[PDB]
Ligand SMILES: *[C@@H]1O[C@H](CO)[C@@H](O[C@@H]2O[C@H](CO)[C@@H](O[C@@H]3O[C@H](CO[C@H]4O[C@H](CO)[C@@H](O)[C@H](O)[C@@H]4O)[C@@H](O)[C@H](O[C@H]4O[C@H](CO)[C@@H](O)[C@H](O)[C@@H]4O)[C@@H]3O)[C@H](O)[C@H]2NC(C)=O)[C@H](O)[C@H]1NC(C)=O
Ligand SMILES: *[C@@H]1O[C@H](CO)[C@@H](O[C@@H]2O[C@H](CO)[C@@H](O[C@@H]3O[C@H](CO)[C@@H](O)[C@H](O)[C@@H]3O)[C@H](O)[C@H]2NC(C)=O)[C@H](O)[C@H]1NC(C)=O
Ligand SMILES: *[C@@H]1O[C@H](CO)[C@@H](O)[C@H](O)[C@H]1NC(C)=O
Ligand SMILES: *[C@@H]1O[C@H](CO)[C@@H](O)[C@H](O)[C@H]1NC(C)=O
Ligand SMILES: *[C@@H]1O[C@H](CO)[C@@H](O)[C@H](O)[C@H]1NC(C)=O
Ligand SMILES: [Cu+2]
């Protein structure tokens with residue numbers, strides 16, 4: 001683990017996480033990037049050093065720290081042309097922010113075009129020395145982080161616009177494609193008799209994964225970065241960019257057990273050990289498990305998750321009982337996605353820079369028809385009705401700058417204004433279920449914040465809008481460092497081929 005103060009050097013390098021060799025974007029020499037860690041209250045100073053040379057995978061870059069509120073530091077959030085211009089090749093940029101009021105499991109990733117798909121992504125943990133769940137496990141360290149990622153043999157800019165799934169699922173950086181089922185698999189070690197806090201992080205660009213471990217049940221204690229009541233399950237469907245902490249009690253016989261992460265599409269199932277890793281008890285021989293999957297009889301359902309501490313839902317407990325209700329109507333024309341009639345196209349001047357330069361109203365802010373001006377210190381309700389007009393469902397939506405209440409989940413026709421889970425990425429479900437996923441949050445974080453489908457190819461296709469929150473205070477609340485004001489002139493001075 002590096003951090004809370006660290007250099008992250010970005011380069012292009014050859015890698016072969018499933019035995020097939022390809023060029024990729026790597027962080028400190030590896031993909032996924034190394035674990036970044038600290039404790040609640042730390043100040044993070046992550047110096048991002050751009051040494052990229054390969055334009056096909058972009059030579060510029062920009063990093064988002066997924067799940068952090070960034071109160072007072074909206075400039076450090078990451079999304080290109082929303083919160084900054086990209087870092088240019090051969091330059092560095094110091095992201096300097098504090099985490100006074102959050103702890104949990106997070107991650108970081110490029111937030112420039114579809115660059116994270118090519119490798120720029122890794123996990124990020126903020127420990128709490130008074131964690132209220134600390135008494136449920138014995139081990140929680142670098143070796144208890146489990147990442148999942150889709151891997152493609154053809155680069156993001158060189159394959160289809162909307163890929164039909166990945167060549168391999170990788171678990172802690174390794175996995176098999178059907179074309180080579182002898183490639184080395186990841187091993188996660190446990191000691192019989194000890195209890196583990198496993199921190200499961202989806203680094204996926206697209207597929208969701210159905211996650212299970214042969215012979216073991218899992219106790220969910222954290223949802224994205226929110227502590228939950230303990231929920232016992234035997235499988236977990238996890239969508240792109242989501243996180244869960246689960247406790248596993250290593251109390252079965254000393255042996256090798258299959259860890260499984262089945263994608264919703266691409267190469268599904270497990271023939272030859274695809275979509276698998278190995279849980280190995282100390283003592284067991286270094287071989288593959290021969291265990292069998294049994295039918296999940298206790299799968300995670302989101303409506304069953306509730307926060308550990310009572311947290312009132314924003315607003316009054318009835319439909320539209322808030323200061324501002326926004327409905328997101330989806331459309332798609334074969335190459336581009338739309339939200340209320342507008343497909344997102346990044347502006348020339350970053351949204352934050354427009355605001356600092358005086359723009360405060362929906363009328364003044366660009367791009368027109370994609371920026372929503374929200375009142376300050378108010379309750380907001382957003383609904384995302386599922387429709388056949390938007391193929392590639394279920395779309396997992398992410399709100400920057402905020403954790404939100406899920407008042408209505410996918411696969412449920414009920415509204416819960418009493419005790420639903422809060423999180424930061426939510427499946428919007430499917431038209432076959434008649435879904436109308438609905439969320440609420442309060443606006444106490446002045447800044448423009450991205451709201452978008454976390455399937456990166458959908459994002460590249462324009463499936464996004466901007467929440468411009470409390471625009472009269474943005475300038476006063478987020479002072480910016482000189483190195484930030486210098487990003488756009490350096491970036492805009494570049495030759496196109498050096499982007
Ligand atoms: C997914 O979920 C969303 C979010 O709820 C639904 O959209 C809301 O849907 C209902 C349509 O039934 C809308 O409700 C109606 O609102 C009228 C007033 O709307 C205006 O003002 C409100 C409040 O300022 C604004 O939100 C809105 O933009 C309008 O400008 C009321 O007049 C209606 O009351 C009349 O009809 C009702 C219902 O039958 C009667 O009970 C009343 O007595 C009255 O005569 C009604 O409440 C609401 O405006 C929508 N919200 C939006 C767009 O934010 C989606 O429809 C749902 N989609 C799917 C596929 O399920
Ligand atoms: C910069 O990064 C890109 C993207 O990873 C690298 O592209 C790689 O480009 C090569 C050369 O064209 C591709 O190989 C070719 O594939 C085609 C199509 O199947 C085949 O017909 C050719 O005969 C050849 O094998 C390669 O697949 C591609 N890699 C990926 C992941 O898409 C490029 O090499 C990098 N540039 C440098 C200088 O390293
Ligand atoms: C896990 O849960 C199932 C279903 O509740 C239960 O019957 C089973 O014995 C548990 N498995 C283990 C290994 O405890
Ligand atoms: C889809 O919409 C976009 C954005 O309006 C437009 O530029 C593109 O040409 C359209 N594509 C098709 C296939 O119509
Ligand atoms: C608004 O701000 C007040 C004052 O600090 C706070 O107590 C309250 O929870 C907030 N209400 C909303 C709707 O954000
Ligand atoms: Cu993210």
Ligand SMILES: [Cu+2]
Pocket residue numbers: 064065066067398399400401
């Ligand atoms: Cu985010």
Ligand SMILES: [Cu+2]
Pocket residue numbers: 392394395396453454455458463
């Ligand atoms: Cu999507």
Ligand SMILES: [Cu+2]
Pocket residue numbers: 064079111398400450452
């Ligand atoms: Cu984002």
Ligand code: NA
Pocket residue numbers: 102103104225226227
């Ligand atoms: Na937390």
Ligand code: NA
Pocket residue numbers: 290291292
């Ligand atoms: Na068997």
